[PDB]
Design a binder for this molecule. Structure first.
Ligand SMILES: [Mn+2]
Lengths: 128, 68
């Protein structure tokens, strides 16, 4: 996967947003932008040129499931890879993620090795 | 009840997929083969939902469902 691939980290808490960014840097990814919620994310995606979205589940205005759904139904970024970050491997939440078209899900707190595993499975799965 | 069968799994995938199945339902008669995993599903979860979940890891063609 191209190391200058552009990431968008979406979370309502600035600390988690920073953690994820540092983790992506530990993995050799430095082209990263942040967003505070679903709405803010859709707005930033408009700029285009994004190759990856990592998003949290719980957020005001627009949560992660809704952001994912909007991404998928958007004919111009419809195939953009999206990794859902969740605080619990909850049965009902994992199905929703799967059916909504998520590229995968990861339970926080997560490690850098876990993230790499998650990224590679998605890259591999999409021939990246 | 019904039977699920998972094939051509790589190293680690048997445990990983057993756990993944855990989060979604209660499995009985679990059989952990070297690169395969089979089990009896209670029926409380729609099969399509399962496929969608396991596909976070494997491919659909590696998943099969059948009556016991
Ligand atoms: Mn949150």
């Amino acid at each position: 996967a191209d190391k200058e691939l552009k990431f968008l980290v979406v979370d309502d808490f600035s600390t988690m947003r920073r953690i994820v960014r540092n983790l992506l840097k530990e993995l050799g990814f430095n082209n990263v932008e942040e967003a505070e919620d679903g709405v803010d994310a859709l707005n930033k995606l408009q700029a285009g040129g994004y190759g990856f979205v990592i998003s949290d589940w719980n957020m005001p205005n627009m949560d992660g499931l809704e952001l994912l759904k909007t991404i998928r139904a958007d004919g111009a970024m419809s195939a953009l890879p999206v990794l859902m970050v969740t605080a619990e491997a909850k049965k009902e939440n994992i199905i929703a993620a799967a059916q909504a078209g998520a590229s995968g899900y990861v339970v926080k707190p997560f490690t850098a090795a876990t993230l790499e595993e998650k990224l590679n499975k998605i890259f591999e799965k999409l021939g990246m | 009840a019904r039977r699920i069968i998972l094939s051509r799994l790589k190293a680690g995938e048997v445990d990983l997929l057993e756990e993944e199945l855990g989060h979604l339902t209660t499995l009985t008669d679990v059989v952990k083969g070297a690169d395969s995993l089979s089990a009896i599903l209670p029926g409380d979860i729609a099969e399509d939902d399962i496929t969608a979940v396991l596909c976070f890891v494997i491919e659909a063609d590696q998943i099969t469902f059948e009556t016991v």
